[PDB]
Amino acid sequence: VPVSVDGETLTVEAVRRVAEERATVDVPAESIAKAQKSREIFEGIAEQNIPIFGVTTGYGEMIYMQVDKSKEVELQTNLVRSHSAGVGPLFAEDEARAIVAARLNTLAKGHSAVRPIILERLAQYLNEGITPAIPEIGSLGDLAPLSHVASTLIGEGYVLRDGRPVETAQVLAERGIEPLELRFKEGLALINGTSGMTGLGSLVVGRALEQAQQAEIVTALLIEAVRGSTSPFLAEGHDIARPHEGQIDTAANMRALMRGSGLTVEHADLRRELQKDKEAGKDVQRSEIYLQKAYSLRAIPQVVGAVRDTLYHARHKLRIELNSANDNPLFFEGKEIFHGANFHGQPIAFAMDFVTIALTQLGVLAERQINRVLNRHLSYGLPEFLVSGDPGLHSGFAGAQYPATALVAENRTIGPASTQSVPSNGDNQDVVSMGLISARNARRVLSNNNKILAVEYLAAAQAVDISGRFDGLSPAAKATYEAVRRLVPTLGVDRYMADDIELVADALSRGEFLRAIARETDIQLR
Amino acid sequence: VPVSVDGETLTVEAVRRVAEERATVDVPAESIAKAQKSREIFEGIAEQNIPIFGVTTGYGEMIYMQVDKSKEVELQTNLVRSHSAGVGPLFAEDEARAIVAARLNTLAKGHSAVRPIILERLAQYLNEGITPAIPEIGSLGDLAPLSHVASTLIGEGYVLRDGRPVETAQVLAERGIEPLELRFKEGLALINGTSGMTGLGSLVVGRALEQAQQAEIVTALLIEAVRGSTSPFLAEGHDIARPHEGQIDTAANMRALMRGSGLTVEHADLRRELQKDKEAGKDVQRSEIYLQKAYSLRAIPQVVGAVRDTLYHARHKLRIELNSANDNPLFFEGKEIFHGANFHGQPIAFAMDFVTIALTQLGVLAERQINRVLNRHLSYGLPEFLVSGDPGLHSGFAGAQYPATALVAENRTIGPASTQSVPSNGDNQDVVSMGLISARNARRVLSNNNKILAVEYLAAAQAVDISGRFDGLSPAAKATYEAVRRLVPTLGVDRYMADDIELVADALSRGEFLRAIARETDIQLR
Ligand SMILES: N[C@@H](Cc1ccc(O)cc1)C(=O)O
Ligand SMILES: N[C@@H](Cc1ccc(O)cc1)C(=O)O
């Protein structure tokens, strides 16, 4: 299962494989050769003492400082050090690995003028399990975080071991590795890109998509458990009447998940049951039958679909970015040293701010579906707060609804960061993107959404037990139901709810509910 | 010249033509035909008194109330009236027209089961200048605003005339038009869609792109005025190293705008001019010749490019939406009436929130470029605050910078609305999109951006006079320069600036600088 880091075809899912599943990485000889190439282009110029940014000059506003080739190695060392000023908590192992891979892929595109050893060493770290200790704060959108990574290649800084930072010097001398010594433009190239936000963003987006699927999965279970109509998901509504890709995809997944359900109702059945319930003698009469259900159980295609569209767009931008030469300056055949701003992370800063927004609404919808099932006037029949015990004496899921509701409110306090640029570096960086903050914002909402969904999964499984509708559940709903009971038992009388919720929340973050559908059925969700 | 409203091929630009230039609309015969057949079939179903949401039942939560068909017109009429509860300011003529246009296109798709007369009357209103008085507030994402529109079709509510509301019944008596009477499902179809946010959103996104163009136009002029480098715009840095579509477009537009400039330099002229400055003596030598770097002028493709991507995504969403049957329930030949939620404006709510964020950043960049030219420390040699006389005694543009700086901060206080749902209607509408609020937010930042750009167009022209570089400008830079000076004179002595700024802001809102590039050069911008 090797992953080709060529600076051209790396996908978001592949980055997750490398970061999450320790997937082996391989930098193609073509990438290596193309890499050495640009290296000679550069050196063929660096030979002379001619001016070039970040290699024969100062850094930032100090580009006005001309520097000779004498202390080539020191210039790189001074940069990586002075810029390793990151603060806050350290990124997690998988997060740090995703960042490292994005940077490797970037250098592997071939226009950074870096020695092949840089790519080879980076590739060794991932493959050898040596993860840099990357503090989360510092990037203006990603100098500081990438600087901490840079430090570990030169045997400095810290590496992540069992959740704690351990000096890189020891770890290397340990597994017998001579720390690299950075040459011209290697220090700058290592840190002058969007690898922080792009690496983290990839994990988040990939996971956001699974969350969309897992929202659809429990949403489907809930719809069955309450015998909702299937009309809202009919293809004519989306494939033909309002063709947004996301909407079509969710409507599709919903039909597959509820297919073969004995509990769901066809519109025609409602229309006919409702009709018989009417007295042809009077113009206006009351009925207890709802031809339609509330928005939270009817508008799933529109809302989750819009979220999907947002995630598709974000994945699209990341795929391009991962495979871009987000670095400066750059080198091309018979070309002058390209001086631009491909280090600017606006594209990804925007994409992630949009992910934050989309996932917030995904959570808003899940929480209202929980409110749906817990409220007796809205549940369509189930007992208040899903009590099995004498009600009042027992509260059921009443208290468990609070953290879900609370999280919706907390996610709404998270504002966009891609527009919060603040000028620094003597007005040199007068417009930045703060994209890493955007990525972290989306990560937070994603994380909070698993807790919201956790309560929804527990609630949906409980509604099944109380209604005694298990034998009517569809193949998918049975799988979902069983995956939940496997982790948490039915709620007879009241009990400490926290562990159960965190138990189902962690399962969701590991994609165990998407897994269950995969194993127990042949449905291949979009 | 007639825009074809067929519910299948309408474009955002087409919508703007109808709304802004009063282009004539035409519902093609095939559309009428489809509407005609779909109606007769629907009427047969209705005439049977079988349950059909909003046609033989109550609205929203009161769908449990069954209504006999003997109350056909009353049911629909009561809906339109009781839902005409909009508040706040009225939309402008062009905004009201875009909304009406989007509604007409929705119904014309042929799945709303409305009588052709409805499509005809709508078009007649557009083609004859009968503009509904539509209050901006009330939509949960667009019942209220659309009900006000619906009210005018039955000769109620108000029509917009000279910025003020005039009772509809009257205007129709003057124009000699007999009000319509609403039949089965016609009241619901007129209001149960996303036409509010989709009509406004179209105008905004259309203008947003023009705003990105004018941002690129003034940036090009400014870069020429200060003799900046053209290297960051080289095709290889985008087309090949970083292929985000928007970024490629901006770089290309910038190259075309500065083509033929005698004031711009290349990275080569700096490294070469730098070699001179440097000497074989010293090892760290300071120069005053910055390898060019202020991001404000180096990152243009990256930042404005990302803005473009956001705008492209939104335009696509709007194109799909304009041609959708965003209404409920829906009729499909030989099938059960579709009862879903295609009225839900989430896709557009998300789209416009993103546009809001994107445009906010566009303004952030412009404001910093203004700061760039007004700060002597960064002016590239220009006098402080572009004073052409005695600084201190005169402040020049020092005061004009404030409205621009203040607007950036003001735009930053505008939060996303697509996530602010609040359950209403007895919890039936437990999750909404708040999309029209999103569209308005976007329109606001758009409007605010014209003011910031206005200050930047003035400072740039001023920079050109003070440095006497008018002769070295490119053909586009001259067109831009003359366009500004045709409106506002050079700033000799300090003077009241408020009028000069508003005049240029207004010119920008009409696309004047984009037009100047059209009739003065052979440049076609993306
Ligand atoms: N990203 C900067 C390089 C840089 C280096 C050091 C800094 O402190 C800041 C910026 C550029 O390419 O212009
Ligand atoms: N959008 C509603 C229609 C509606 C909603 C609320 C009302 O108050 C009236 C009508 C639906 O299609 O289900």
Short summary:
Chain A is mostly helical and 526 residues long. Chain A is built from 19 helices and eight strands. The first copy, chain A, has two domains: 1-193, Fumarase C, Chain B, domain 1 (Orthogonal Bundle); 194-526, Fumarase C, Chain A, domain 2 (Up-down Bundle), CATH 1.20.200.10.
Notes on the structure:
Chains A, B: This is MIO-dependent tyrosine 2,3-aminomutase. Chains A, B: Its EC number is 5.4.3.6, 4.3.1.23. Chains A, B: Homotetramer; dimer of dimers. Two copies of one chain form a homodimer. With 526 residues, the first copy, chain A, is mainly alpha-helical. In chain A, helix 9 runs parallel beside helix 14. Helix content of chain A is 53%, strand content 5%. The first copy, chain A, folds into two domains: 193 residues, Fumarase C, Chain B, domain 1, CATH 1.10.275; 333 residues, Fumarase/aspartase (Central domain) (Fumarase C, Chain A, domain 2, Up-down Bundle). Chain A has a two-stranded parallel sheet. A two-stranded antiparallel ribbon of chain A has the order 4-5. Chain A contains 19 helices and eight strands. Chains A and B meet through strand 3, helix 10, helix 12, strand 8 and helix 13 of A and strand 3, helix 11, strand 9, helix 12 and helix 13 of B. The complex binds tyrosine (2 copies).
